[PDB]
Amino acid sequence: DHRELIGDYSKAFLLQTVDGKHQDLKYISPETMVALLTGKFSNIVDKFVIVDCRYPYEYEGGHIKTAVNLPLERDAESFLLKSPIAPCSLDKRVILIFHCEFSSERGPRMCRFIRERDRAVNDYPSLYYPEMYILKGGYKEFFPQHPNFCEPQDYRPMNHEAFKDELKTFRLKTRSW
């Protein structure tokens, strides 16, 4: 591989990455998301968690199959770090994929937050989640390309006319503005 090692310096990144806003983060395309969903990496990837950081109404109006909705930092830490999601075999990998509507600001931030917490509870350079990626373009670019991998087969933008109130209600739940 021509890149650096994953977070615990144990091995190279598995997935092919594409260029994204944050030069230091690893992004993947809809295509690689589908290869994982289709089991193309089944002999090496034990588990892969898709974290959809969007607000609940967004997730309810259409999300990627198997994805988990973890819109708040506290929910993500609770879900991923209280009892780490570990592979059934040590020859195997666990991978996290973060995304939001277009995975621009919120996705990167949650990803950076989980890495910090992970660095915090482990002895360097050990990690529970050494390999993390962001889905370039988020759901918004994923849906039109592979609608049958989404449930419900639909899309609800964050700024949807009819949920202005839910967006407001929801922002008031975040730890900081």
* Header resolution in angstroms: 2.1
Longest dimension (CA), the chain: 48
* Distance (Å) of CA 96 to CA 13, 35, 132, 137, 173: 12, 14, 5, 16, 24
| Alpha carbon 171 to its chain's center | 20
* Distance (Å) of CA 38 to CA 75, 86, 160: 27, 20, 31
Q: Do residues 10 and 130 make contact, with C-beta atoms less than 8 angstroms apart?
A: yes
- For the chain, give percent helix, strand, coil, nearest 5: 30, 15, 50
**100 counts as catalytic:** yes
Determine the Cα–Cα distance for residues 42 and 119; give it in Å rounded to an integer.
27
Burial status of residue 14 (CB atoms within 10 A of its CB: 0-12, 13-18, 19 or more): middle
**Of the listed 53, 100, 111, 150, which one is catalytic?**
100
Tell me the domains of the chain and their CATH numbers. Answer: 1-177 (3.40.250.10)
Burial status of residue 92 (CB atoms within 10 A of its CB: 0-12, 13-18, 19 or more): middle
- Please name the residue ranges forming H helices in 38-171: 56-60, 73-81, 106-121, 138-142, 164-171
- Please name the residue ranges forming H helices in 12-156: 30-37, 56-60, 73-81, 106-121, 138-142
Determine the Cα–Cα distance for residues 36 and 119; give it in Å rounded to an integer.
26
Determine the Cα–Cα distance for residues 100 and 37; give it in Å rounded to an integer.
18
Q: Do residues 33 and 46 make contact, with C-beta atoms less than 8 angstroms apart?
A: no
Residue type, 68: V
Q: CA angle, corner 52, sides to 51 and 54, nearest 5?
A: 145
Determine the Cα–Cα distance for residues 50 and 36; give it in Å rounded to an integer.
10
Q: Do residues 33 and 97 make contact, with C-beta atoms less than 8 angstroms apart?
A: yes
Determine the Cα–Cα distance for residues 136 and 121; give it in Å rounded to an integer.
28
Q: Can you read off the two tokens belonging to residue 140?
A: 């918004």
State the Rg of the chain over Cα.
16
Among 34, 37, 66, 68, residue whose Cα is nearest residue 51: 68
Helix (H) or strand (E) holding 37: helix 30-37
